Design a protein around this ligand. Structure first.
Ligand SMILES: [Cl-]
Ligand SMILES: [Cl-]
Ligand SMILES: [Mg+2]
Ligand SMILES: [Mg+2]
Ligand SMILES: [Mg+2]
Ligand SMILES: [Mg+2]
Ligand SMILES: [Mg+2]
Ligand SMILES: [Mg+2]
Ligand SMILES: [Mg+2]
Ligand SMILES: [Mg+2]
Ligand SMILES: [Mg+2]
Ligand SMILES: [Mg+2]
Ligand SMILES: [Mg+2]
Ligand SMILES: [Mg+2]
Ligand SMILES: [Mg+2]
Ligand code: NA
Lengths: 325, 325
């Protein structure tokens, strides 16, 4: 791991940094880079809803093409599925030999949606927390750990430059892990699909369905598989499985140890491996890009179905009771 | 549902409430009862781990039997597996005709581990949040939704008494839902086993294993299935599936919609139905009680096995980098 003493802040301080996009990460990076003495400009199309906010924070904003021409380091933090078009239309025609093209995730480069030219460095700085936390920790003199990767390095200083950037957003205060674009994106997609945004939600829905079908009230079903999951995951986030299991009752702990491996069995793990294979072979990403090109039809259909699940109906009613939410 | 105008605080204010056991919910009951003008004493053995924090709050502490003798409402917060022995020895002979026996969960009465005498009320008040939140809401003039059940009611006033108790801890400020001991405990155990403390953890572990067996770094695996789950579950807790899916990227959302139902499917639901049957038929509880009687040997063996999982090794290392946890 790399820490503050492994990174030289004067490197990034000597580079003009363009941040393309002003979502959570673009906001956190741009403000922290500026605080660290870096000359920053934000790249947004002229009609962007974010332009007035960038300007209110005292930052200069230009189009992505203008920022790419001006900058020595172009950090791309636009939405995943929008990056290829920004690259082809705005960034690629304006890259200069010896520029560095930075990303917050490995997807676009790894899967060939963006094919950088040979005359630029290509690197990634990926903080392991939401932008609000990246910024809050930085302002308080601390940091959020980051992943860094260097995919192309024709000037030989790509890692030093990426570590300098990480230091300028606080990442080396906590620690930086070096990885690859391939590993970052394949593990990210895999975790999203099997656990974060697929598996856990389907597990909650399935438990809810079983209870309602058995004639238990939907309100109790909501509490006992969804509402109560926040405490569990908060405990794991802070102290791992050990902390959570110590905190819950012996009845919950014993029940979890016996029933968990029945719910998630060897066959479930084999299906995970199938989902990983379809990430690794490019087929999932091909399907995603095709759906985007067609107007997000399948995404929008599946979105509506999940939004209409009965857990959503009862959950809205119960969350209306909760004055801290 | 029941609200403040449905409950009469003067009822519980006229009762002597003995809280037997304490644990993480103890303050949410005992401090709010006291603030609401109720006389409270806490029954704990001399060696109890809760004694220091109870004494720090200036609550009078005595043995369970002495508190039960003094009290005319006995609220049992002790661990579910310890309640039957406390009840038989310390509570039952000290329930005078017309006393009330209260619980925060339905397990012991529903499964017959505690058989109350015929001359007492038997009721449940179950706040639906962590104790710290229930108490904080109360202090701020607000509340957390509660469940209330009345299992035995010789004087005909048990619901009024339970609602008065709920009002004194803030539950009627937010809303009280009527249920039964049976439904509270069967849904609780089912959710703990299939989702909260079994299924989600085994899903996380399986995903971690798949990544590290495929050669990806354990550090990335930890982040992508465990660390990042907190943001997801926080979003669902606040706004359901819809809010979470709106807030994650298109790639994460589309991937979850496609891969989630491949990981968790109809086969999973059938296994959940078997787990539910073993809750309903008393066999899980019988196995739990027998293990407790034998010295917790199976629980301790499974606890050790889980504590040794490789996600725990890398997780401790990475959480040490995070100052905010
Ligand atoms: Cl973010
Ligand atoms: Cl409230
Ligand atoms: Mg304004
Ligand atoms: Mg302009
Ligand atoms: Mg220049
Ligand atoms: Mg991820
Ligand atoms: Mg992602
Ligand atoms: Mg324990
Ligand atoms: Mg005393
Ligand atoms: Mg008697
Ligand atoms: Mg009667
Ligand atoms: Mg529960
Ligand atoms: Mg429980
Ligand atoms: Mg379904
Ligand atoms: Mg039985
Ligand atoms: Na008594």
């Amino acid at each position: 791991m790399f820490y503050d003493d492994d990174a030289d802040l004067s490197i990034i301080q000597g580079r003009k940094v363009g941040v393309i996009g002003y979502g959570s990460q673009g906001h956190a990076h741009s403000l922290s880079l500026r605080d660290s003495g870096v000359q920053v400009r934000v790249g947004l199309k002229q009609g962007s809803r974010s332009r007035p906010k960038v300007e209110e924070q005292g930052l200069d904003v230009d189009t992505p093409a203008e920022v790419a021409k001006w900058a020595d380091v172009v950090m791309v933090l636009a939405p995943d599925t929008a990056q290829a078009e920004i690259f082809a239309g705005d960034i690629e025609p304006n890259l200069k030999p010896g520029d560095a093209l930075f990303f917050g995730h490995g997807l676009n480069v790894h899967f060939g949606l963006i094919k950088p030219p040979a005359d630029v460095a290509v690197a990634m700085v990926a903080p392991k927390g939401p932008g609000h936390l990246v910024r809050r920790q930085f302002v308080d003199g601390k940091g959020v750990p980051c992943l860094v990767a260097v995919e192309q390095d024709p000037r030989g200083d790509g890692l030093a430059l990426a570590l300098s950037y990480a230091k300028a957003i606080g990442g080396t205060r906590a620690g930086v892990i070096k990885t690859t674009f391939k590993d970052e994106t394949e593990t990210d997609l895999f975790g999203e699909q099997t656990v974060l945004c697929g598996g856990t939600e389907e597990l909650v829905k399935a438990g809810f369905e079983v209870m309602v079908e058995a004639g238990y009230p939907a309100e109790l079903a909501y509490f006992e598989v969804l509402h109560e999951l926040k405490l569990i995951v908060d405990l794991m986030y802070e102290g791992g499985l050990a902390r959570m299991y110590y905190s819950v009752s012996d009845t919950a702990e014993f029940g979890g140890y016996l029933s968990g491996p029945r719910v998630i069995d060897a066959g479930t793990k084999e299906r995970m491996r199938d989902i990983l294979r379809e990430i690794q072979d490019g087929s999932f990403v091909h399907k995603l890009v095709a759906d985007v090109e067609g107007g997000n039809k399948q995404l929008e259909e599946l979105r509506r179905q999940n939004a209409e699940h009965p857990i959503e109906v009862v959950g809205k009613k119960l969350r209306d009771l909760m004055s801290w939410v």
